[PDB]
Amino acid sequence: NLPWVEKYRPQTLNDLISHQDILSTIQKFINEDRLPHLLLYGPPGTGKTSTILACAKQLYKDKEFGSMVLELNASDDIDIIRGPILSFASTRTIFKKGFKLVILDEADAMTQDAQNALRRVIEKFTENTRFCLICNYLSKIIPALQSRCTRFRFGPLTPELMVPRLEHVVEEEKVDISEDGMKALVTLSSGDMRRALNILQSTNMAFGKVTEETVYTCTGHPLKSDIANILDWMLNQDFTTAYRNITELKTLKGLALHDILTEIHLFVHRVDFPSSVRIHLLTKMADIEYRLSVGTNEKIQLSSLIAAFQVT
Amino acid sequence: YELPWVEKYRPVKLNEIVGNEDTVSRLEVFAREGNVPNIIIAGPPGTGKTTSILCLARALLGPALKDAMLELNASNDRGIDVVRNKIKMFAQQKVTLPKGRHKIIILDEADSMTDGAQQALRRTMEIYSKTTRFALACNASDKIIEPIQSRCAVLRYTKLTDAQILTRLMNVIEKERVPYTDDGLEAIIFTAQGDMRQALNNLQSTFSGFGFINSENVFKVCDEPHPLLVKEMIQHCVNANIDEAYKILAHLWHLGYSPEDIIGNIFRVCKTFQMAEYLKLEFIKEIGYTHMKIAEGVNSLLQMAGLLARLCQKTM
Amino acid sequence: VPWVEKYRPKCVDEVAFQEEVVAVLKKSLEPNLLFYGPPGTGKTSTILAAARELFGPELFVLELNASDERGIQVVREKVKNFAQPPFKIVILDEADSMTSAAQAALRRTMEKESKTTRFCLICNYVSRIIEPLTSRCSKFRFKPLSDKIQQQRLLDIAKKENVKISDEGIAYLVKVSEGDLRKAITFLQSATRLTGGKEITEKVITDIAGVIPAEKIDGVFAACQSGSFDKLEAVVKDLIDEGHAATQLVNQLHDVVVENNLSDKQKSIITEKLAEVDKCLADGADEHLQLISLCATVMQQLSQ
Amino acid sequence: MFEARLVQGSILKKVLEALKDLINEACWDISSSGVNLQSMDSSHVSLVQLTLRSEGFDTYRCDRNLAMGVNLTSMSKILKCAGNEDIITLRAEDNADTLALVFEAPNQEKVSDYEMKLMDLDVEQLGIPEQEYSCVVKMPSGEFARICRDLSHIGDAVVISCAKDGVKFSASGELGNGNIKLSQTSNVDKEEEAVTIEMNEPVQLTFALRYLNFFTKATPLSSTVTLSMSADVPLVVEYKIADMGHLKYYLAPKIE
Ligand SMILES: Nc1ncnc2c1ncn2[C@@H]1O[C@H](COP(=O)(O)OP(=O)(O)OP(O)(O)=S)[C@@H](O)[C@H]1O
Numbered sequence A: 001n002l003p004w005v006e007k008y009r010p011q012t013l014n015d016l017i018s019h020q021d022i023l024s025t026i027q028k029f030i031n032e033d034r035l036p037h038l039l040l041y042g043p044p045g046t047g048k049t050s051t052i053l054a055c056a057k058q059l060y061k062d063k064e065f066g067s068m069v070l071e072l073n074a075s076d077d078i079d080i081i082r083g084p085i086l087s088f089a090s091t092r093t094i095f096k097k098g099f100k101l102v103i104l105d106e107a108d109a110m111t112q113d114a115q116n117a118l119r120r121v122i123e124k125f126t127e128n129t130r131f132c133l134i135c136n137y138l139s140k141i142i143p144a145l146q147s148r149c150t151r152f153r154f155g156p157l158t159p160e161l162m163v164p165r166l167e168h169v170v171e172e173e174k175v176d177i178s179e180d181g182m183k184a185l186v187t188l189s190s191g192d193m194r195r196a197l198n199i200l201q202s203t204n205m206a207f208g209k210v211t212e213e214t215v216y217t218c219t220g221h222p223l224k225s226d227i228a229n230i231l232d233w234m235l236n237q238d239f240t241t242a243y244r245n246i247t248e249l250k251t252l253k254g255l256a257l258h259d260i261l262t263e264i265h266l267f268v269h270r271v272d273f274p275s276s277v278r279i280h281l282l283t284k285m286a287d288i289e290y291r292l293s294v295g296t297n298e299k300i301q302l303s304s305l306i307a308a309f310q311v312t
Numbered sequence B: 001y002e003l004p005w006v007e008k009y010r011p012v013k014l015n016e017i018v019g020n021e022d023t024v025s026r027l028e029v030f031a032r033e034g035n036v037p038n039i040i041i042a043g044p045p046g047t048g049k050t051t052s053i054l055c056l057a058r059a060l061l062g063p064a065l066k067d068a069m070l071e072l073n074a075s076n077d078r079g080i081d082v083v084r085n086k087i088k089m090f091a092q093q094k095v096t097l098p099k100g101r102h103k104i105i106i107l108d109e110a111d112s113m114t115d116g117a118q119q120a121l122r123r124t125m126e127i128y129s130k131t132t133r134f135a136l137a138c139n140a141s142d143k144i145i146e147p148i149q150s151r152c153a154v155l156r157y158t159k160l161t162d163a164q165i166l167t168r169l170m171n172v173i174e175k176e177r178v179p180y181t182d183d184g185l186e187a188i189i190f191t192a193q194g195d196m197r198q199a200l201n202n203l204q205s206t207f208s209g210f211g212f213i214n215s216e217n218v219f220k221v222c223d224e225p226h227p228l229l230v231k232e233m234i235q236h237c238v239n240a241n242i243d244e245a246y247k248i249l250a251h252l253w254h255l256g257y258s259p260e261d262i263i264g265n266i267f268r269v270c271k272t273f274q275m276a277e278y279l280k281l282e283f284i285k286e287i288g289y290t291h292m293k294i295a296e297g298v299n300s301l302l303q304m305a306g307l308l309a310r311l312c313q314k315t316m
Numbered sequence C: 001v002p003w004v005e006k007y008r009p010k011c012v013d014e015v016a017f018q019e020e021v022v023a024v025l026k027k028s029l030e031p032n033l034l035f036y037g038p039p040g041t042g043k044t045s046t047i048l049a050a051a052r053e054l055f056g057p058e059l060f061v062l063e064l065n066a067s068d069e070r071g072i073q074v075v076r077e078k079v080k081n082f083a084q085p086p087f088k089i090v091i092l093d094e095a096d097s098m099t100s101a102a103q104a105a106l107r108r109t110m111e112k113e114s115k116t117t118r119f120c121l122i123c124n125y126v127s128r129i130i131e132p133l134t135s136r137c138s139k140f141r142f143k144p145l146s147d148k149i150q151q152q153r154l155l156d157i158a159k160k161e162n163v164k165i166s167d168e169g170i171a172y173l174v175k176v177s178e179g180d181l182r183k184a185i186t187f188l189q190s191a192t193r194l195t196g197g198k199e200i201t202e203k204v205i206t207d208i209a210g211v212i213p214a215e216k217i218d219g220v221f222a223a224c225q226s227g228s229f230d231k232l233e234a235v236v237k238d239l240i241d242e243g244h245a246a247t248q249l250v251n252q253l254h255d256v257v258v259e260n261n262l263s264d265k266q267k268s269i270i271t272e273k274l275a276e277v278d279k280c281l282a283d284g285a286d287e288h289l290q291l292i293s294l295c296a297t298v299m300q301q302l303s304q
Numbered sequence D: 001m002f003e004a005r006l007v008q009g010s011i012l013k014k015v016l017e018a019l020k021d022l023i024n025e026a027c028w029d030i031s032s033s034g035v036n037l038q039s040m041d042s043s044h045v046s047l048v049q050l051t052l053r054s055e056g057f058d059t060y061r062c063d064r065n066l067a068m069g070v071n072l073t074s075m076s077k078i079l080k081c082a083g084n085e086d087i088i089t090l091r092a093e094d095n096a097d098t099l100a101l102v103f104e105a106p107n108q109e110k111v112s113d114y115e116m117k118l119m120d121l122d123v124e125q126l127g128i129p130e131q132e133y134s135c136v137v138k139m140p141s142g143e144f145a146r147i148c149r150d151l152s153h154i155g156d157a158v159v160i161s162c163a164k165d166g167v168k169f170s171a172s173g174e175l176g177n178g179n180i181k182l183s184q185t186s187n188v189d190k191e192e193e194a195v196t197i198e199m200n201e202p203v204q205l206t207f208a209l210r211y212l213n214f215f216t217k218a219t220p221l222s223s224t225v226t227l228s229m230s231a232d233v234p235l236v237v238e239y240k241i242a243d244m245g246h247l248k249y250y251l252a253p254k255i256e
């Protein structure tokens, strides 16, 4: 039915979590009519399009929200700048007094010429239309454009902050969550509340109970024991019987070499090596990843990885 | 509604531009004698190109600036039809100016004009040069087709040294009486990277958000990987200590800094570092290789760890 | 019509040897579907059978591949256009070759359109698909058919189409395209046009499958075993003048190096060089020079 | 149900041709006291408000309130089929989602029936803040249409200025500047032809000209137009539809 990523949206500005400094500064901006152009950037699912929407609903009303807020996605399309944006920023709204708000979601998919045009539009109409850009890679935004507006990095949510909200969601709903299912959910989410709530809802709706095994099977994430097995084949076996074992496991479950390689890197850093061997393992694994990035055979790259581990 | 400091303290005459003493000296000569050629000012952002062209046009024309100057931004329609109608009718328009003065057609962001527009602008530049002078500005001076550069003096602009940004920042601080400290000013100069408009924007944003200016506070509004952590990571990599450098690397990765940002800061810090010389060059080589591999799209933590392993094994 | 489609399954519980996928596909009325498995194991055939069962012969499903050259935006745009039996089925083939940023966008497109269109992601690796797409989908592994079944079905095809092929010919046909029933059937089809039905010997299969004969591989190892650089130059020149691609030589050379009695150090070195040469060839390097280099490494490894 | 008989459908046709190009689709709010239409254009810069009282119609019968969100383009396309002197009967059944326009003839042997398909519009009635204007110019509609259509040739921004001795409309553009100044007539031969400037404080404002040209397409409705305005308040162009109501365009000033 209704997804939990929408039912538990923070409707106000204080229901946001883990960004108390940024939220307090934006609230102070609102109180003093000093709201500058904002550039909210960071990893997905961290609360950007919710922060600015709460700020808007606090700033305008619900009927002024169609004629004084231009929610525009930048991934649909230089014409979008001199088109609707320049025609929205330059004109007043008839009876309403106050600035307007333009919300450019995915503001980093814009070509550089479009960002030049938009920077001039911003610079011109800066007292009747406040722009709020939203992106994931501030490096993709022209330094010129970013200079114009104050920047806010919405980093990922630490697991201490985000666990109470998940506990409130669990208690409000009826989810029999284990003491580690929460841990295997926080880990797999990797710090974006959207993915955490989505995974939780989908697994609870598919299997009926969340634990450290059910979430790992619902998301198809390679289990830790399997990667331990692969590292053991590589580290304590013959070359050919390791190739055979690893290939059989890699085809048994759906498993590529990118994921094997990532988890094996984490394990190389986990387990104890003479610290002059992991310099070799790390170098070779970072070369195998580049080799795989160009569309090569995985039957020769897997063998190269086993060769890398055969320094032992 | 008070306007930002980027504009409240915009220099209104070329004696106040701190950018590039030689080029601004040439432009003061032109503002004195008065017969400017079509000039293309090219350079990195934030360094005072638009300001220089505006101050030059003002000092040339004077009170006829409303009548003799035509500015066309990137936010204005500048297709082939506008170049063939509006710019041409302005070049042909009669304005009576003093002996050596000419009308000025400022095409800001000249690298944003399509090729057809510049082709249509060539002969307008060439014919009416007896009464009309063009002053283009751009960042990528190769986006301007060659026949347009052939009829313009290509004035190059360069990034600002840290001393110039510091002088202008102190001139602004004196007028605003903002409480500061040396570490805060060094933080602003580090986050600016030459852009004199970035520095002012960071100064105003920091002062308006918090007041007092200290590095701890500067890195609370800019918020890029603290250069002390990157210095510590490079130091661990100098002592061939991989397990202690990957510590800092995974710490930075935990806070969600994109690997492009991590590499940018690692490069900018390893360039002005305190290693040997040959070792510094051997480090910068590997950092450049990994930057290539990350810009290409292989941006996983494994590539950063491989870079750390190479940096370690350079020093045995 | 080609034999790869003439002999596709027409129903769900009909011929598909996989049982736990054909049972759930009856209740498919977990909103989406996610099939993964080795190529040529009835991935698309099964969903097409399910769609011909559900919708009907005249009710005719947009099938497109997510590995397009035209970026990801045109893919999701086409999905939106197709969006407007209370739903329609869109198939995404090669859905693992999408970068994570392109799957994030396909995720938004498929979750904003989660009311009228059902999705089916077909891939060879479920680990390459990110956790949102898999978490929204229901997985189904497709394991290849057993070797004996392969030969059985191929004989059935060769008797339904009257293609006189030896039984050892069928064994070699399934051996030359390992566990790839689609590839084996396509080879059987395109290898009878090459003869007009007179006789299809294993040489025709070896030519169509692009497999360099095992004699040339044994010659390469005989040269690099002990000999001057002139022998390597000669054998590589003869192997290139024959037309055999360097990818196939690298592939088969690796297959021989791995499962033989070379030392672990030698196998490690030779396989590292094989991987480097494979990337070099994939980057457009010249086959003659890469083969010369690989043979020089193999020679200095074996001769010592 | 909604049953209204208009003796001269020319009025309805001119209204639809005045609203056709400013707003695409509007919510005709039918009531027992009259007909209203308040809506702002797609750019939210101008707000048209039409009112047609009940007494202007011959037999206006409305028992329950209605909100017929007609598509104005299609409605005008249908109204074009009517004659110039036809009697027009609008009939909206209690709830049928169709509006029957019946174009009778001027007592002849032709009757036309049209069933315009309505569409559901999300009605919104924004408050029009009642305000006191500092200048009220009353001028022959032909002159205002001419002034706007002329200054549109020069610039896209008309600067309207109310002094006491006359109102002047200025404009400036690439080909120079031009300003048309009208003085209030003292010997009004025809009360239509007069230009009466009720001035309480000298004002000066700037307005776009696309929208003033959109307003001046209602000139066949009335001979006199009333430009009422004050500082920092949207100008009000009023055309009085004779003895049956009015058509009032609001326009927000121009920035800079
Ligand atoms: N700080 C937060 N407090 C409460 N809920 C949050 C927070 N961050 C994320 N969420 C939840 O996660 C959902 C998605 O968050 P969004 O603000 O949409 O993330 P996002 O920054 O827009 O991600 P993008 O747009 O793909 S970069 C919301 O519906 C919330 O329920």
Ligand SMILES: Nc1ncnc2c1ncn2[C@@H]1O[C@H](COP(=O)(O)OP(=O)(O)OP(O)(O)=S)[C@@H](O)[C@H]1O
Pocket: A144, B005, B006, B007, B009, B010, B011, B016, B017, B018, B019, B020, B043, B044, B045, B046, B047, B048, B049, B050, B051, B052, B138, B139, B168, B196, B197
């Ligand atoms: N050299 C300089 N000396 C003094 N102030 C400067 C200088 N460069 C920039 N500024 C300040 O920065 C503001 C903006 O600089 P601009 O002249 O806009 O630079 P710019 O070359 O136009 O940068 P672009 O157009 O984004 S590439 C000015 O209003 C000044 O206050």
Ligand SMILES: Nc1ncnc2c1ncn2[C@@H]1O[C@H](COP(=O)(O)OP(=O)(O)OP(O)(O)=S)[C@@H](O)[C@H]1O
Pocket: C003, C004, C005, C006, C007, C008, C009, C015, C016, C017, C018, C038, C039, C040, C041, C042, C043, C044, C045, C046, C145, C181, C182
């Ligand atoms: N388990 C099976 N049951 C029935 N027919 C099968 C089976 N496996 C393979 N086939 C046959 O093999 C042919 C190919 O199956 P496909 O579904 O096209 O494989 P595939 O998944 O498309 O491989 P790709 O597209 O190259 S990744 C079909 O014509 C089927 O008749």
Ligand SMILES: [Mg+2]
Pocket: A048, A049, A050, A105
């Ligand atoms: Mg968002």
Ligand SMILES: [Mg+2]
Pocket: B049, B050, B051, B108, B137
């Ligand atoms: Mg500029």
Ligand SMILES: [Mg+2]
Pocket: C043, C044, C045, C093
């Ligand atoms: Mg298929």
